[PDB]
Design an enzyme around this catalytic site. Sequence first.
Site, short mmCIF file in Angstrom:
data_model
loop_
_atom_site.label_atom_id
_atom_site.label_comp_id
_atom_site.label_asym_id
_atom_site.label_seq_id
_atom_site.Cartn_x
_atom_site.Cartn_y
_atom_site.Cartn_z
CG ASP A 158 34.03 63.44 63.47
OD1 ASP A 158 33.25 62.87 62.66
OD2 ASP A 158 35.26 63.45 63.34
N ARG A 162 31.28 55.29 63.46
CA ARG A 162 32.54 55.05 64.14
C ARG A 162 32.48 55.57 65.60
CG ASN A 163 33.36 59.32 66.42
OD1 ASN A 163 34.36 58.71 66.77
ND2 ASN A 163 33.43 60.36 65.62
CG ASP A 176 35.82 60.23 70.64
OD1 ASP A 176 35.97 59.72 71.78
OD2 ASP A 176 36.62 60.07 69.67
C1 LIG Z 1 42.06 53.64 70.45
C2 LIG Z 1 41.07 52.80 70.73
C3 LIG Z 1 39.83 52.75 69.90
O1 LIG Z 1 39.69 53.52 68.92
N1 LIG Z 1 38.83 51.88 70.22
C4 LIG Z 1 37.55 51.78 69.43
C5 LIG Z 1 36.92 50.58 70.07
C6 LIG Z 1 37.50 50.49 71.47
N2 LIG Z 1 36.81 51.31 72.49
N3 LIG Z 1 37.02 52.66 72.69
C7 LIG Z 1 36.21 52.99 73.72
C8 LIG Z 1 36.08 54.23 74.25
C9 LIG Z 1 36.01 55.26 74.67
C10 LIG Z 1 35.81 56.54 75.21
C11 LIG Z 1 34.61 57.19 74.97
C12 LIG Z 1 34.40 58.46 75.44
O2 LIG Z 1 33.14 58.93 75.10
C13 LIG Z 1 32.92 60.33 75.33
C14 LIG Z 1 35.38 59.14 76.17
C15 LIG Z 1 36.58 58.47 76.40
O3 LIG Z 1 37.61 58.99 77.09
C16 LIG Z 1 37.49 60.15 77.91
C17 LIG Z 1 36.82 57.18 75.92
C18 LIG Z 1 35.48 51.88 74.21
C19 LIG Z 1 34.53 51.53 75.21
N4 LIG Z 1 34.03 52.42 76.04
N5 LIG Z 1 34.09 50.26 75.30
C20 LIG Z 1 34.61 49.37 74.43
N6 LIG Z 1 35.51 49.53 73.47
C21 LIG Z 1 35.90 50.81 73.40
C22 LIG Z 1 38.91 50.92 71.35
#
Ligand SMILES: */C=C\C(=O)N1CC[C@H](n2nc(C#Cc3cc(OC)cc(OC)c3)c3c(N)ncnc32)C1
Length: 282
Positions: A158, A162-163, A176
């Site tokens: 994916d 966005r990711n 992700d």
């Molecule tokens: C539900 C919250 C959401 O969608 N956000 C988008 C922007 C914000 N945000 N999310 C993250 C993250 C993460 C993350 C990434 C991973 O990569 C493999 C694995 C994860 O969990 C095991 C979590 C984020 C970060 N890192 N910095 C700033 N804003 C972030 C909330």
Amino acid sequence: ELPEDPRWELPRDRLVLGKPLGEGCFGQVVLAEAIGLDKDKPNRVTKVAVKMLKSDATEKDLSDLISEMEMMKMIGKHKNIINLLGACTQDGPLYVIVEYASKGNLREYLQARRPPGLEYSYNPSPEEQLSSKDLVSCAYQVARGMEYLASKKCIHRDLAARNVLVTEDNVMKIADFGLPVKWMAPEALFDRIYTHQSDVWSFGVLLWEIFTLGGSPYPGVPVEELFKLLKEGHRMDKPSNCTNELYMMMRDCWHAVPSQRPTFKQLVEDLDRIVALTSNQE
Ligand SMILES: */C=C\C(=O)N1CC[C@H](n2nc(C#Cc3cc(OC)cc(OC)c3)c3c(N)ncnc32)C1
């Protein structure tokens, strides 16, 4: 009852939970401060992000979150992915600690740096515009991230703007990679066959996202139709600012025969030459 892993464990007391970074969405992700992530600098505080289960969670949501962590552990560390920093497993609810990206996801980041006066593509925020060299640089970086994941035999499934998350230093970090139709290669839509080659398709759609400064692909095309159009050799049109060379790259990524798509190795090499020859002047 998750097994202790001292490679990764952080005592809960060394973690101070701040505000949610999410906008009412998947799982939960909050900003935090971590005390002494480095054992050789145990009095320094580090801004981090923390993923945890929501209140309404199941024993499948927990297993999924566990898998994600264990996978990030195996895949290892790269500049251009979101790295695992640690975990709180024992003394209460599961926390997974990862790198903080201050500038949000790549769609948001590009949108906010659109020219204010475009009726076509408005600015919904007005941050400094990106040069064409900056934009080719975003694509190079995301390709390097994917070259790494691919070398660790990780298939993303994916990949999209966005990711991808962006740090204070404008560093692209793929997210992700251890857990939509308009990013899926035809063979993914049809036969549910996912490969590095179908990831390369998605990367094509992501190049388009970049050069449209975060546009939504196949605008106005119903999802229901989407498969047939592609089989008939339908592709998205070149973005207005995109060079012919970078459109060729998108099209090549969008080859119908998977084996004929370029690899992430090749894309990296190609974006490395392109970046170096692309001007920052515009
Ligand atoms: C539900 C919250 C959401 O969608 N956000 C988008 C922007 C914000 N945000 N999310 C993250 C993250 C993460 C993350 C990434 C991973 O990569 C493999 C694995 C994860 O969990 C095991 C979590 C984020 C970060 N890192 N910095 C700033 N804003 C972030 C909330």
